[PDB]
Design a protein around this ligand. Structure first.
Ligand SMILES: Nc1ncnc2c1ncn2[C@@H]1O[C@H](CSCCNCc2cccc(Br)c2)[C@@H](O)[C@H]1O
Ligand SMILES: Nc1ncnc2c1ncn2[C@@H]1O[C@H](CSCCNCc2cccc(Br)c2)[C@@H](O)[C@H]1O
Ligand SMILES: Nc1ncnc2c1ncn2[C@@H]1O[C@H](CSCCNCc2cccc(Br)c2)[C@@H](O)[C@H]1O
Ligand SMILES: Nc1ncnc2c1ncn2[C@@H]1O[C@H](CSCCNCc2cccc(Br)c2)[C@@H](O)[C@H]1O
Lengths: 336, 336, 336, 336
């Protein structure tokens, strides 16, 4: 786990990463709107910013009137955050604390915790756990921004995406590649390709049923709740065809005193750098319009700051079933 | 850290997709097969050590050439796949896969020839050359090495579009009011981070402003420790007037066999490989006239990330115009 | 056979085909040079033009001074030939005879027979048989233009051409193509692709040994000699590598009283619309430089105006062998 | 002749490569699967006749939709391959391959629905529609046909580059001294032959000078003999001024099921298929002004080459400017 955590924080030490995330207008703009339009939740309040990065969310909190903001960052980016606090003349209101939120010391309980802990499928990088851990500094009336997170799952049809895996793996199905028979590895290649969640976007037309929503309430959830996430699903198919897998996206809600602001990564919304995630079935399942596709998606926290994904699905009316295992730490970025 | 970087490195090389991507480079694979097969008498009834064999392709080339025994050492999980291919190609009596690092494994026998594919970006990335040289502890006194030598070519280049691209990227951190936040205090750092990135892609040779300077490493003679600090002096005679935006790097390797010397070239005058070429930019370009001399030093210092900290000091001798640059070979910009 | 012959003559009824053949400057120019520079073989002579098409060769014979030329054509193109004889005011010297040379009546034995009977690999379309049949109208001192034909065979190496067959056939190696398992046909697809001679050109560097020449003397050969053509070969390899198959080209010689003129389709010569032909081995054969590749190419005339090609090859020093069957009536035109 | 053309046709369709090329058209295959699966109740426990099944893909779609029994009739040798796929897909109890022509085979049972892919270039090439209509002798009174209807779209176009290409090709036969030979007497014929060729490729819709005229064939109602002579009147209202170089043709087919009507379109406003579009050129273009009417008739007469002799008579009614053209749908120019 340590070898993955050090690489994770080294990755987040680069200003290019901060710039790429900040330039996502959905992300930065929705956070600023949620904080500013709920200024009553921040005016004169104590704020904790978990994983502040360059500190942008802490600056938004200061713009809303917070009396004191503790911005905690474990990567070297914390240094740069300090530079921004001095240059914006906010040292008396924003305190940058280098280190992990689980280890640093806060001198004071906070009125509200703000963070951007979302990864792919909302759970990748496991930072939500740190977010929930930060609740040890939250007052009994405390609030969380974001307040809740909805993960949406939906069956999809994409014959060409399914085809790509075998077209790629069939490189190995050659009896004389420079005189070498590679065919014995074909199966392994196939498996390796199917274990990769596919990060890109798609047309909403490929969705075959209304999505199923799994909700995490960050005010109520505990850290260990995220180690094992079981999402049952029962889709009522709106179209007839082959189902090649499940599509995942997420939304988060900032539930403030004045209003609730949503940040959505749905394929019906403008594209973000979270894109959408698709997990293929090893074998597709034929469903008639009106059938029910029932099963379970089990996300198990792994030692690489990600999740093993186990998906089991069946068409109830026919008994056809498919079972698939994926590793979210090695996704295939297909967007071009 | 060194342990974590090694863990990530070998996990990266455990994937069959990486083997496919490297093997589908026909220049690499075809040149290796040509060098081995056309020097078959260097392998006929010989003892072969394959350093970092991956899927084993070079071991199969050596077997085709008539090698009596080939020890194929691989530290990643790909070793298992190699064994599969050894069994399915009915070469269990000649190819012996040995899992683990070549620095730690035990071979039962001294080898007549060492074969490997140790070249990274700029030929020095991943520091695998060190392991390659380490393998000489198993080499017989009359032994040979494939590749035998490695030439690094440096040449000044002009590319205003590339400089403008990287500078425009860095210009994000010059904004005084990004969502009302002053980022300008970090701009310097931003610029540094962007110009520490080597640019990996190809280019037209018309951007080169002088004939290349060649630095040779003789793998037969070189010792492992030699690669901890590599100093490459250079004195280019400028053939065109204009702005030098940095130095371009490519490399050749020569398999100096008994029958024949076979070259593998990644030069921009040659068909493209997955090595491409690597350009190091200067934060401030140097104006030079044709007939001037551009002199300086490229210093590679081995770091614990299986890479090199690169220092490039260049100057137009006629005007004393000097440029000092740092480059982190662990954060390349893949421009495609 | 009839269903193929009617389609053959329908194909040759189009003026676009005549234009494409005439615009091949090697073809038309070499025929004109051979006839004109051997004018003593045509001056005041009787000439038979077998398969005259538009009549161009007969016009060349008239330009050389022939007293009477009988131009025989079986397709509808004969009509157009007549139009050209009237418009060029050569009706008193050129007589167009519609129909097949085996069935039409000639009123007179001829001094010389001219024709362009060459197909792919010199033997495709089997028109050489008709050419030899025309000798029933030849005087005992008669001559043939072309006089002789050399077919050259040589072993070649082309790893990518071999790879293409399996890349194409692996379309069928899919377990769910729109829900259908196609894999059971993969083998058949492979076989179908390997049975296609590949018509294109290539770099002479891919040739691995000096060519072996098989000669037909049209003055001495009989029609039935072309039904079964056995070409033994013993190549002495000039390079070490894998042999993926045999490359075929041809030359013809016009041996006239004044001089001999060659028309060559060799890959060392300018490209013609005959290109070159390559027959792959199902499995490549490794040969060291200095080894001998011995075997037989057997061309058997088939019922579709083409040949079944049986190729048997072995590396003598190792005993490795390959056996391959091809149908020249369904070649793959790879030139792009 | 008819027998020889049929022999060549079915030999052409015996090749697995043709099956791959047609099946790799995702618009064709995907639209057929969508039409069948989304109208699954038209197939659930029904009797299906697949006319010209080739590799059997549509029969497999019908089986996926729940068809109880599917008779898959194929006259080429591909029938054998279909049987292989039936056995390897474990559908021997539902899909019965019947080799031979649908006009000659005996089915044991009347069918609930006929499915086929009978469309050629201009929808009418290969005359397979006739066979399709013939299959209605096995159709139950309440039966259905997939496709149900076919729309042919005609539209005048301007393309000076295409006209110049074909005219330049024909200009070869205007030479007075091609190697000293006068070809000009054939130029007329040459021009005719080149402009009898339909041009199969795609184009931008900006070349169309009027809204398309639609001619519909109802496969449910149409009789086989109806396709021996097809008269398509047209009266275009010209939307742009300029030169009409000919008429462009494309086609749609509608699967009118119980649940849903699914369209397969080869229109230039739609993603490209292997049908492309087909343009018939005029030897002399017709000048027309916007607001004029271009009226005439396209007459398809079925010939013994499994194709149609096409006559196109068009005129600008305002000026009496007339153009009569013949086209041989057995000699298309594939412009890619
Ligand atoms: N225990 C900790 N203590 C203190 N800080 C911590 C701790 N864990 C993490 N962090 C810091 O939080 C930050 C990561 S969260 C960004 C999550 N969005 C990713 C993302 C993915 C796809 C699209 C987009 Br758009 C954004 C880093 O700065 C990191 O160093
Ligand atoms: N100490 C060790 N002992 C045993 N094996 C080792 C050890 N270190 C590494 N390896 C193995 O050697 C292999 C790496 S070298 C390939 C270097 N080309 C990269 C490359 C870059 C750009 C383009 C292209 Br095209 C190729 C891997 O299989 C790796 O696991
Ligand atoms: N028994 C017969 N009696 C009378 N005429 C006959 C008879 N058989 C054939 N022909 C006529 O000869 C002509 C065919 S030979 C052209 C052979 N070059 C092909 C070729 C292939 C690749 C490149 C190039 Br460049 C040229 C046709 O006009 C044909 O109708
Ligand atoms: N009387 C018969 N009885 C039984 N089967 C028959 C009969 N006639 C024919 N067939 C079979 O039907 C099939 C031909 S129709 C495919 C028409 N699309 C062509 C096409 C053109 C451009 C683009 C694309 Br994309 C596809 C072949 O399998 C053929 O052997």
């Amino acid at each position: 786990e340590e070898s993955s955590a050090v690489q994770y924080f080294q990755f987040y030490g680069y200003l290019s990463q901060q710039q790429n995330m900040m330039q996502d207008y959905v992300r930065t703009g929705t956070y600023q709107r949620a904080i500013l339009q709920n200024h009553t939740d921040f005016k004169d309040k104590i704020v904790l910013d978990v994983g502040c990065g360059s500190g942008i969310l802490s600056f938004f909190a200061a713009q809303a009137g917070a009396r004191k903001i503790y911005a905690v960052e474990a990567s070297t980016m914390a240094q740069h955050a300090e530079v921004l606090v001095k240059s914006n003349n906010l040292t008396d209101r924003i305190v940058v604390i280098p280190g992990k939120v689980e280890e640093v010391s806060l001198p004071e309980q906070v009125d509200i915790i703000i963070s951007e802990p979302m990864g792919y499928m909302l759970f990748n990088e496991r930072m939500l756990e740190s977010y929930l851990h930060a609740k040890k500094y939250l007052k009994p009336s405390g609030n969380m921004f974001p307040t809740i997170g909805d993960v949406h799952l939906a069956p999809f049809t994409d014959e060409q995406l399914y085809m790509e895996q075998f077209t790629k793996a069939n490189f190995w199905y050659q009896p004389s590649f420079h005189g070498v028979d590679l065919s014995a590895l074909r199966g392994a290649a196939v498996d390796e390709y199917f274990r990769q969640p596919v990060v890109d976007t798609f047309d909403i037309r490929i969705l075959m049923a209304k999505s199923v929503k799994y909700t995490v309430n960050f005010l109520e959830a505990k850290e260990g709740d995220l180690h094992r996430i079981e999402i049952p699903f029962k889709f009522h198919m709106l179209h007839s065809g082959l189902v090649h897998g499940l599509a995942f996206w997420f939304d988060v809600a900032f539930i403030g005193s004045i209003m609730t602001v949503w940040l959505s990564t749905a394929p019906t919304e403008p594209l973000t750098h979270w894109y959408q995630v698709r997990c293929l079935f090893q074998s597709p399942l034929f469903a008639k319009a009106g059938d029910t596709l029932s099963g379970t998606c089990l996300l198990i926290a792994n030692k690489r700051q990600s999740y093993d994904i186990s998906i089991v699905a069946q068409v109830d009316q026919t008994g056809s079933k498919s079972s698939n295992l994926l590793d979210l730490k090695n996704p295939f970025f297909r967007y071009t």
